[PDB]
Design a protein around this ligand. Structure first.
Ligand SMILES: *[C@@H]1O[C@H](CO)[C@@H](O)[C@H](O)[C@H]1NC(C)=O
Ligand SMILES: *[C@@H]1O[C@H](CO)[C@@H](O)[C@H](O)[C@H]1NC(C)=O
Ligand SMILES: *[C@@H]1O[C@H](CO)[C@@H](O)[C@H](O)[C@H]1NC(C)=O
Ligand SMILES: *[C@@H]1O[C@H](CO)[C@@H](O)[C@H](O)[C@H]1NC(C)=O
Ligand SMILES: *[C@@H]1O[C@H](CO)[C@@H](O)[C@H](O)[C@H]1NC(C)=O
Ligand SMILES: *[C@@H]1O[C@H](CO)[C@@H](O)[C@H](O)[C@H]1NC(C)=O
Ligand SMILES: CC(=O)OCC[N+](C)(C)C
Ligand SMILES: CC(=O)OCC[N+](C)(C)C
Lengths: 286, 269, 135, 189, 135
């Protein structure tokens, strides 16, 4: 008569002969459509030196289980329940380009199950993904870091992904103060791997992020320009002052120190050269 | 005692009590959960990483009608201790946590009254993200929030309610670097959602400026006061360049040190 | 499906399948494991610490005669996905690891064919010791 | 006849109807007296900047369980047994001023159980506690870092603490070479 | 092998083996444990913290009289692997460790011989405190 007692009866019924290791389709030729979407909670870090992006996201997933249906009229009008997500079959979505993190979701929060067989699962995850960093116009640079998600062991004929929404969700986004998200869109792709004869789909999100340059402006650019203002002064100093060497040596050493400081920030990649680095090197040469 | 173990066996008997089910009675009702945050210590504020670490006791109180018993049948026992891991809990977590730690640290026992009232007061070491304001450093005042929500149940299943409008400082250990100003709590709904509820605490803390005054500001003022001497130095001494270059070097070094102290955010200078 | 869950229950039944025993039919018979490494990404080489970090997919193929079934008796099912945590696995590890991490990172599903062939391709983030020549 | 067979019999007898979630007192008004002591293996770190002290200690606890009793004459003169600590009731002693560590003991070594109901449990534990640091006379400074221990959910009427010994045991202390312990004493409050 | 499955079930039957009881009969005799540390690698020596990190195998050997069988009844099997978490273990740990990691890292299988001899070789990563001489 009480909702709790009806829910207990419903739980006893649902998991009587439930097998969590079997794909939840009534017919073997059916595909499990998994509506997949990302919601970003905060951009924890963009590590330019190590070329990794740390993000805190909610991995919104939604599929249909054919053995987890009931009639609410038979259970005191219980329309939905929350169940441990480890008691049911779940899609094995993993992040392909993981780097220093975990491939799959590890928190395993409870899933929201509806009487019509709809399962909603929105666990949190912290992902550290590799992305190529381009610092040509640092600190006015724009980065394009990607995240590739897809089922690891089920191909397109067994599990197919559906874009919940093309745009990543930012309704509960904790602003960083260092980067701004220009665009965050997920793209559906299919491709064949030499491992396997079937087609494995994936959704790749491209995070186009723009750096807010004020901090590095003040702390690097302006001091470098102030030192650069003094590069030619030695040729106007008279030779009798006995201080030409002091000035030019000080300028050289300051420029070298600032170049070393920049080196500790940018990745040690040989594909692009920052403009700030080229300017400092040429100033040091002259 | 024999009576206590008989009672504990009766209450937690899995055949009669399922901890996965909300204790909702009267139909499609909601379980009311009372929250109260008690600040035991403000461990640290890390400006560079923008993380606040706190040691808090999280009071959670609700009613579970299934955990009821008659005192007469059980030697007039009025309350018992039950392992929190074996009863239904409202999965209240720190939503804005940094370091990805949502739950409490210990999972102590829950004190259960014969009428079904539950009293749970687990301790926790929490790392919460907060936005550091750098403009007035080292005379700055920070506003770091702690958002508590159930990451299992929405507003149609449980209702979060504050026990007091402020956080308790009854057993607080003073910081030494930060001064507590106000710790108000607020229950927030969403007019356009109807399934969202949270309880948020604002930690208004004020830095004690003596340490950074002495160690950073007075040296900076001392170096700054040397910027004008180059114009009173005679040209024959042959040491103008030494003086002005040295002053510039010291000023730049202090600028970089301050840059390493404050968070690397671009909202303010 | 009902047939798939019947098959999976039959295969993993702890009564008739002990995942702790090598799938060797005879006492002297040996299980052959086929290994292939697929390099997804060379993450970093740390010269000072002498560690190479790679993102690799480790293919492992063997046969488990106990995980066989007749397709005609199971609606003509030719293969199934079983959790690798519940079947016998060859404990193939990165022996020269530099971070104490021996095993793979995910433990994905193993693909089992009706004849007992097992195909397992877990991803892994490996940190291996490397002598660095800095001359 | 063998000791193993008698021990198996004793173990089966002791845990036939044992409930580890119930305070082990014959009568409700009784108090579980827990003798509490500390032995410091080493002073791992005194972090002045972060004001945390890291220690490696043995948390010595002793109490009486009225259900874990037997007569050794009936069990081939078996006077005591080592049992996993997760099978029996234990006091929930936690470190109040924890900072960046664990509140409770987590290692859960085996407990030593004597035929008269006595339980001796001495697990190890790494503790990271807060202590206010005073550097007025640094580097000639003397610090005073405290560790507060108590039952989390049982009041004095149910669990009472007894100071095993006044001073922290230092028989197996690993000297650091940076710090010297002038005095380590536990105070009942 | 079916014979090995039968042997493993026979040896670890709860009605004749309790891992909570030390294999010492006829009074509280002593179980002699033979110890041998084999150094896999000297990971590092952090002098600032005075901590040495090593990778070792903590070889342990002892005799369990309850884990004996007649080889002729089990296809002349003379050794069997048993999960170390299912047999009585001597709880040998590193006492002088810093960071509070006492136990071994993996808890590998133990190799039981037909006469009751156990040979366990668990890997371990240890962080031990030591006195650094800076002179
Ligand atoms: C499953 O789907 C296929 C393709 O439509 C169909 O041929 C087959 O009859 C279906 N099976 C059942 C049991 O309906
Ligand atoms: C069942 O509950 C839903 C809300 O979950 C409500 O809208 C509906 O009217 C209820 N029906 C009955 C018959 O009580
Ligand atoms: C970012 O990268 C993705 C994938 O490489 C590409 O599709 C997209 O056009 C890029 N966007 C920008 C702004 O570079
Ligand atoms: C428990 O102790 C109280 C206090 O002496 C006593 O009144 C009561 O009778 C005792 N109960 C039993 C069962 O002996
Ligand atoms: C029982 O064992 C104890 C040692 O634990 C010994 O002192 C005593 O004499 C023994 N008694 C008998 C009857 O064997
Ligand atoms: C150390 O502190 C404790 C409690 O704060 C106090 O009782 C004791 O007297 C202090 N001792 C010294 C030497 O400061
Ligand atoms: C079947 C299987 O395990 O495939 C893993 C590799 N992937 C994701 C490229 C297909
Ligand atoms: C009952 C309970 O959980 O109390 C916790 C707080 N303490 C240890 C200060 C009493």
């Amino acid at each position: 008569e009480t909702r709790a007692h009806a829910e207990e009866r419903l739980l006893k019924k649902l998991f009587s002969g439930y097998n969590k290791w079997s794909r939840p389709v009534a017919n073997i030729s059916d595909v499990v459509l998994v509506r997949f979407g990302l919601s970003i909670a905060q951009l924890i870090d963009v590590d330019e030196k190590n070329q990794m992006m740390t993000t805190n996201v909610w991995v919104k997933q939604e599929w249909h289980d054919y053995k987890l249906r009931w009639d609410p009229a038979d259970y005191e009008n219980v329309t939905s329940i929350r169940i441990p997500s480890e008691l049911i079959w779940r899609p094995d979505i993993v992040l392909y380009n993981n780097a220093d993190g975990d491939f799959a979701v590890t928190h395993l929060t409870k899933a929201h199950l509806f009487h019509d067989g709809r399962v909603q699962w929105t666990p949190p995850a912290i992902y550290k993904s590799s992305c190529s960093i381009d610092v040509t116009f640092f600190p006015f640079d724009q980065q394009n870091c990607t995240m590739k998600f897809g089922s690891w062991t089920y191909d397109k004929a067994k599990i197919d992904l559906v874009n919940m929404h093309s745009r990543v969700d930012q309704l509960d986004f904790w602003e960083s103060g260092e980067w701004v998200i220009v665009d965050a869109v997920g793209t559906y792709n299919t491709r064949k791997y030499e491992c396997c004869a079937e087609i494995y789909p994936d959704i790749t999100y491209a995070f186009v992020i723009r750096r807010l340059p004020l901090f590095y402006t003040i702390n690097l650019i302006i001091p470098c320009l102030l030192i650069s203002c003094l590069t030619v002064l030695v040729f106007y100093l008279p030779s009798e002052c006995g201080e030409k060497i002091t000035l030019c040596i000080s300028v050289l050493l300051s420029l070298t120190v600032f170049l070393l400081l920049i080196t500790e920030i940018i990745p040690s990649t040989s594909l692009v050269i920052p403009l700030i680095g080229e300017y400092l090197l040429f100033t040091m040469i002259f | 005692t024999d009576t206590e173990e008989r009672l504990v066996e009766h209450l937690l008997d899995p055949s009669r009590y399922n901890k996965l089910i909300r204790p909702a009675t009267n139909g499609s009702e909601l379980v009311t959960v009372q929250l109260m945050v008690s600040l035991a210590q403000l461990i640290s504020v890390h400006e560079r990483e923008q993380i606040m670490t706190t040691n808090v006791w999280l009071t959670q109180e609700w009613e579970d009608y299934r955990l009821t018993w008659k005192p007469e049948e059980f030697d007039n026992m009025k309350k018992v201790r039950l392992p929190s891991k074996h009863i239904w809990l409202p999965d209240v977590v720190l939503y804005n946590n940094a370091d990805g730690m949502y739950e409490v640290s210990f999972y102590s026992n829950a004190v259960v009254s014969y009428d079904g009232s539950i009293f749970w007061l687990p301790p926790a070491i929490y790392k919460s993200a907060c936005k550091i304001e750098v403009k007035h450093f080292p005379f700055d005042q920070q506003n770091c929030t702690m958002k508590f929500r159930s990451w299992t149940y929405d507003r149609t299943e449980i209702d979060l309610v504050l026990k007091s409008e402020v956080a308790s400082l009854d057993d607080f250990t003073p910081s030494g670097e930060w001064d507590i100003v106000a710790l108000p709590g607020r229950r927030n709904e969403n007019p356009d959602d109807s399934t969202y509820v949270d309880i948020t605490y604002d930690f208004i803390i004020r830095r004690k400026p003596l340490f950074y005054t002495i160690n950073l500001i007075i040296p900076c003022v001392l170096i700054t006061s040397l910027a004008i001497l180059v114009f009173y130095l005679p040209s024959d001494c042959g040491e103008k360049m030494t003086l002005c270059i040295s002053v510039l070097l010291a000023l730049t070094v202090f600028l970089l040190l301050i840059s390493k102290i404050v968070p690397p955010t671009s909202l303010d200078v």
